[PDB]
Design a protein around this nucleic acid. Structure first.
Lengths: 519, 754
DNA sequence: TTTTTTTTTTTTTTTT
DNA sequence: AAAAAAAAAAAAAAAA
């Protein structure tokens, strides 16, 4: 029918549930494993595909935004650029994933330059966030048009969720995770690997609390403990302020050395001015901002008839020098939202690294076995080069040459006999049928091996290349042995994971910025 | 010779997969129509002129031919006998079969030359159940339809048990079809429209005759295959009929005298029509062939109807007068059915009438003959304004997402977006004191948002505005919802518009099964298209269930459980049987393992139920876990679906099984490989165009899809229960978040569950 | 160069 | 105390 009646209840329910599930799964919340939203994941994938390496030259932000919008992200420009701007600026992320050139804003409230002015490049840590992507370590999902494919999750080496934090709003849910120090988070991961039945008290010993990019003070610790036990808690972030007293005269000045997280300095100065004008806060004679690009310095001159400590306490209570940070650790786990505590996040990351390393070893073992098969073909061919060239000359076309090569079993030379029998088993690919290969001192080439022998060039008949093939075969046998050793023992998998985590801690180690105090 | 017996046994093992449902007697008639279809395919080449079908008293069906004279056949495998006599090359030859096994040298001589092959096949009582004899009515109906469609082809029928007879021979063809359809009814004019013009290889035949029943009955065929759901030929037929009749009324001025504009479903009222088409390579929406989706057929039918129906109307003034009188009477009845109303000033070049600048208003001053399209933005507004009907359709583009009036205060409704909406509708909704819905300027308010997630959200916000602020407008049925497509998909000449991702999945399955033949054995006939389609549909349903079960159990184990034998409750009592079953399962899992997982089994002896349940250990990524298949899982319903699909897929692929897609061929070892190959071959020339809103659609594409009343697909918003609607709106759209979270989580769990 | 909405926690105003 | 209203963080829809 042209017109078919629909109830308002069913239409509203279907439309709003589609929107809510779409926002919750896709855009709002992050994934617990790689700690990235789909827009972040697609931006990083587009930059990696373009080749925005940290040591390569910069590229214009417009090119990256157009590449993301055209191929991967169907949701319009000027939000992708906002994501890139937030990822490129150090006062937002504890470890920036984008290396930007130009104006990307400031804590004073200046907006970033337009898309046409700035230039964009990957940070060095973002490469370790995408390590071994080409070794089929993660599942690739299709594009919106089906023309390309995007990773479902990144094979991260950094715990990006705990490290950089997150903040987003879904329809039903809303996530708010603070950033942490990478060294302490890696130490917590190593402690978990050492003892998987580790308590949250031990994880708190290794991870005392969050570490915001803006160095500050965290008043309490009950909020941190509640957040790391239940996944929710309230933290109070204080400003670094000192009532510096003049030696010559009794007048005093309050100098705010550092500011809380996600607090705009311009709005703070404006609000202090508003309170002074309305006389809600007394004792303030003057107000200035003397940030000389050497930190920040907000000078507040106290009057003679004012203690100064009381003025600073009143500024803490009323102004935005104290901010309540409500922790709400909601993230996607197995493609559904879930409130997760510290140990759940660490366990999820370690499971992700287990999966990534196992898939990487499977891919490398398959590649090594295939190359060993091809090298066996080349060695047997160069052992019997004279009858092979005679057969190829006698045949009329390459297809008949391939059929003749496959039909004739080939004698193993002395070099090939010593090479192949030293390898023994554990070098044939799994898919290879038992008919082919060495059988009673006579090789049986496949169609692929005959094709490879036909593709052999005359350069390989030189004396050096046969020794090169022998050495490469020995190296591949050793690599296959090491890969089988990793895939066999469950402890060697954790040895590899621990070595990778220790190397990541060594390369990107950093010191604490925020202080946890007792009050 | 040995290969033939393998094919006959393959057909006879699963006769329902090939011929159809044998229980209700459809298979016997399908066999008869297979033989008759072979005869008619012979007849289409201008050789045969007589097909004497018979129904002997011995429960046997002869299909005689007088034509020209002519693997493993499906028809002779099921039937317990054949009597093949071919009177070719001046000598009569004879062959005898028995369950497909010939017993002769297949070469005999006889007197008289003649032509044609007569085949008396005897259906086997073993394969078919509950229907032994043949219903004369079904064969008579289908043979008469074939006689109508294949004009100038005698089709005798002689029921020898009763002595009945028939002789279907109609040289008129489609005109005879219309006469047969209208013989019981009362046609309103004597002549019958008819043409049989062919163009570009698409032979088209159409006929028409109106009657007094005010019922629509349009039948359509494609290569003598009926289409229940119409298709492109039906759409082109309707478009051409409406265009020609509207142009005729405009030219002669009948409409001005009546002061009423006829539309679709008035011309089609009281209509009998047949639309026979002959495409060389037709394309259907499914293997049932209930809908033709061939893009080339609409244009041919449209052009030929547009020429020849107008030509017929010019040369038949009396019948045109009678049909136009009927259409005028129907239009007058429709006009009388409407609610009272008054004319409204419309925005125009001379007079703007104090309406918004963004309103692209229409020319019709009468509400109930005008429409308003509420679109999402200015680019969508431009795309909709470029393609529309200026007489009827007005456009009022919004600006992104609008206020949530549920959360917002009444005084917060001072936004430019909502004031612009209120001015155009002119219900005076602001204040709830001047709100008079009788002064509504359009009696059709169409929420034509984009076809994506945020379009759905904006649709919900608009529905909140219309339900909360203008509740009587929703009650009276003025609010409509358009359904623009999200995807356009093209394979060379073929083109289709797809609304949802579920429709995209169905379309992908349809291409995968398009022209695909699956052979269980190397020497055996292909499966029926409908049987393979049902197999693939059930397979995808079980795969979706297994994906839902991915957290509880590994996907590999559940996928392997399809091919293993079933484990009933009685099996759980025996220690040995469960051990053998789980050992076979784990060995099969270990053999086909492409990753590092290592599968092991154990059996836990329950002292309460006195059973021996199995456990499936797995060591994946170095993590060891156990998955006991408890008593709940064995009778859980999920395992019932897995077992039913397993019973269907135990032995559908022997060692030498293969599939084909015309020229291309592929041997297969599992149904997964066949499905993957079919999908991969389907997506070769494919190209999907996703529309990120109406600004990416051309105005012609937007007009063809969801602005034309002929091809429109709308929905009227209605309120079944006021209380339930109020509760749902308050929960989903109110200030409190906890009921919204509970609703979302409950629906997520419901989706995860059954 | 500039502006309007959706969405959820959390705080601050302000008004009673 | 109470209750409502406003603003702000980040991904999305829209334009001027």
């Amino acid at each position: 029918r042209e017109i078919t009646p629909v109830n308002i209840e069913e239409e509203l329910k279907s439309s709003y549930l589609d929107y809510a599930m779409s926002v919750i799964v896709g855009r709002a919340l992050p994934d617990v494993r790689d700690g990235l939203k789909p827009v972040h994941r697609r931006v990083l994938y587009a930059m990696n595909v373009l080749g925005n390496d940290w040591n390569k030259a910069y590229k214009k932000s417009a090119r990256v935004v157009g590449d993301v919008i055209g191929k991967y992200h169907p949701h319009g420009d000027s939000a992708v650029y906002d994501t890139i701007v937030r990822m490129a600026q150090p006062f937002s992320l504890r470890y920036m994933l984008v290396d930007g050139q130009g104006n990307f804003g400031s804590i004073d409230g200046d907006s970033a330059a337009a898309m046409r002015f700035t230039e964009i490049r990957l940070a060095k840590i973002a490469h370790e966030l995408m390590a071994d992507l080409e070794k089929e370590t993660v599942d690739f999902v299709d594009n919106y048009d089906g023309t390309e494919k995007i990773p479902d999750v990144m094979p991260t080496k950094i715990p990006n969720l705990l490290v950089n934090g997150s903040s987003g709003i879904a329809v039903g849910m809303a996530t708010n995770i603070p950033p942490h120090n990478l060294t302490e988070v890696i130490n917590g991961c190593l402690a978990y690997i050492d003892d998987e039945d580790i308590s949250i008290e031990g994880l708190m010993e290794h991870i005392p609390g969050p570490d915001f990019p803006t160095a500050a003070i965290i008043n309490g610790r009950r909020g941190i403990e509640e957040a790391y036990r239940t996944g929710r808690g309230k933290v109070y972030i204080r400003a670094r302020a000192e009532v510096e007293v003049d030696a010559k005269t009794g007048r005093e000045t309050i100098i705010v050395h550092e500011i809380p997280y996600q607090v705009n300095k311009a709005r703070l100065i404006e609000k202090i001015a508003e309170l002074v004008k309305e006389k809600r806060v007394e004792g303030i004679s003057a107000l200035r901002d003397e940030s000389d690009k050497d930190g920040m310095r907000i000078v507040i001159e106290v009057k003679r008839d004012a203690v100064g400590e009381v003025v600073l306490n009143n500024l803490y209570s009323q102004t935005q020098l104290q901010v309540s940070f409500g922790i709400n650790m909601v993230a996607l786990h197995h493609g559904q939202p879930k409130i997760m505590n510290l140990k759940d996040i660490i366990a999820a990351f370690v499971r992700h690294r287990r999966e990534v390393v196992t898939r990487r070893t499977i891919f490398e073992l398959r590649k090594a076995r295939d190359r060993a098969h091809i090298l066996e073909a080349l060695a047997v061919a160069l052992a019997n080069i004279d009858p092979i060239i005679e057969l190829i000359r006698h045949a009329p076309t390459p297809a008949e040459a391939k059929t003749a090569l496959v039909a004739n079993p080939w004698q193993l030379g002395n070099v090939a006999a010593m090479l192949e029998r030293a390898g023994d088993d554990a070098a044939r690919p799994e898919w290879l049928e038992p008919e082919f290969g060495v059988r009673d001192g006579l090789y049986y080439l496949t169609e692929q091996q005959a094709q490879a022998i036909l593709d052999l060039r005359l350069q390989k008949l030189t004396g050096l290349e046969h020794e090169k093939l022998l050495d490469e075969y020995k190296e591949l046998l050793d690599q296959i042995a090491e890969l089988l050793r990793i895939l066999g023992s469950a402890d060697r998998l954790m040895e590899v994971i621990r070595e990778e985590l220790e190397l990541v801690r060594e390369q990107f180690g950093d010191k604490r910025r925020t202080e946890i105090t007792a009050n | 010779s040995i290969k033939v017996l393998k094919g006959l046994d393959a057909v006879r093992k699963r006769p329902g997969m090939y011929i159809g449902d044998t229980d209700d007697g459809t298979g016997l008639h399908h066999m008869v129509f297979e033989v008759v279809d072979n005869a008619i395919d012979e007849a289409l080449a201008g050789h045969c002129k007589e097909i004497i079908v018979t129904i002997h008293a011995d429960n046997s069906v002869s299909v005689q031919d007088d034509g020209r004279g002519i693997g493993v056949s499906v028809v002779n495998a099921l039937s317990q006998k054949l009597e093949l006599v071919i009177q070719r090359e001046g000598k009569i030859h004879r062959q005898i079969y028995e369950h497909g096994v010939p017993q002769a040298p297949l070469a005999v001589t006889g007197e008289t030359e003649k032509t044609g092959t007569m085949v008396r096949f005897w259906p086997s009582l073993e394969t078919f159940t509950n229907v032994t004899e043949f219903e004369y009515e079904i064969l008579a109906k289908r043979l008469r339809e074939l006689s109508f469609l294949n004009s100038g082809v005698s089709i005798r029928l002689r029921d020898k048990r009763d002595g009945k007879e028939d002789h279907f021979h109609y040289e008129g063809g489609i005109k005879a079809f219309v006469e047969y359809l209208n013989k019981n009814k009362t046609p309103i004019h004597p002549n019958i429209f008819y043409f049989s013009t062919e163009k570009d290889g698409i032979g088209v035949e159409v006929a028409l005759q109106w009657n007094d029943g005010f019922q629509e009955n349009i039948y359509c065929f494609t290569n003598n295959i009926p289409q229940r759901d119409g298709g492109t030929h039906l759409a082109g037929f309707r478009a051409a009929m409406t265009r020609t009749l509207n142009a005729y009324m405009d030219k002669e001025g009948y409409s001005k005298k009546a002061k009423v504009s006829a539309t679709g479903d008035d011309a089609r009222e009281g209509l009998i029509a047949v639309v026979s088409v002959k495409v060389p390579d037709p394309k259907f929406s499914s293997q049932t062939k209930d809908k033709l989706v061939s893009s080339e057929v609409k244009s041919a039918v449209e052009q030929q109807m547009n020429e020849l129906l107008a030509e017929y109307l010019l040369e038949n003034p009396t019948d045109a007068k009678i049909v136009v009188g009927k259409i005028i009477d129907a239009a007058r009845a429709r006009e009388a059915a409407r609610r009272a109303r008054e004319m409204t000033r419309r925005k125009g070049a001379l007079d703007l009438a104090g309406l918004p600048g963004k309103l692209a208003d229409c020319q019709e001053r009468d509400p109930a003959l005008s429409e308003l399209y509420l679109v999402e933005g200015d680019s969508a507004g431009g795309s909709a304004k470029q393609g529309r009907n200026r007489k009827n359709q007005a456009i009022l583009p919004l600006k992104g997402k609008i206020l949530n009036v549920e959360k917002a205060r009444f005084d917060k409704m001072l936004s430019s977006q909502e004031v612009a909406t209120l001015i155009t509708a002119l219900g005076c909704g602001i204040g709830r004191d001047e709100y008079n819905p009788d002064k509504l300027r359009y009696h059709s308010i169409i929420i034509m948002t984009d076809a994506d997630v945020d379009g759905s959200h904006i649709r919900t916000l608009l529905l909140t505005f219309f339900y909360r602020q203008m509740p009587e407008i929703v009650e009276r049925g003025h609010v409509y919802i358009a359904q623009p497509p999200l995807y356009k998909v093209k394979k060379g000449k073929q083109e289709q518009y797809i609304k949802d991702d579920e429709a995209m999945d169905q379309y992908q399955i349809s291409i995968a099964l398009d022209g695909a033949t699956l052979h269980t054995n190397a020497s055996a006939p292909a499966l029926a298209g409908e049987a393979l389609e049902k197999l693939v549909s059930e397979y995808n349903a079980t795969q979706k269930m297994i994906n839902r079960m991915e957290r509880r159990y590994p996907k590999a184990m559940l996928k392997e459980l399809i091919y293993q034998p079933t484990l009933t409750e009685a099996d759980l009592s025996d220690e040995q049987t469960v051990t053998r079953w789980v050992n076979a399962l784990v060995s099969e899992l270990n053999d086909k393992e492409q990753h590092g997982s290592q599968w092991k089994f154990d059996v836990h002896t329950n002292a309460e139920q006195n059973l021996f349940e199995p456990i499936v250990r797995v060591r994946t990524h170095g993590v060891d876990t156990d998955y006991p298949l408890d008593h709940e899982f064995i009778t859980g319903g999920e395992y019932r679906r897995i077992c039913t699909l397993g019973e269907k897929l135990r032995g559908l692929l022997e060692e030498d099984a293969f599939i084909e897609r015309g020229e291309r061929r592929q041997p297969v070892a599992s149904f997964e490989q066949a499905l993957d190959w079919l999908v991969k071959e389907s997506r070769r020339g494919l190209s999907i165009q996703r529309y990120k809103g109406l600004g990416e659609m051309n105005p012609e594409q937007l007009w063809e899809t969801t602005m034309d009343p002929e091809s429109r697909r709308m929905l009227r918003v209605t309120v079944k229960d006021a209380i339930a609607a109020d509760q749902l709106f308050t929960t989903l759209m109110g200030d409190a978040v906890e009921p919204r979270r509970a609703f979302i989580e409950e629906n997520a769990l419901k989706a995860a569950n059954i």
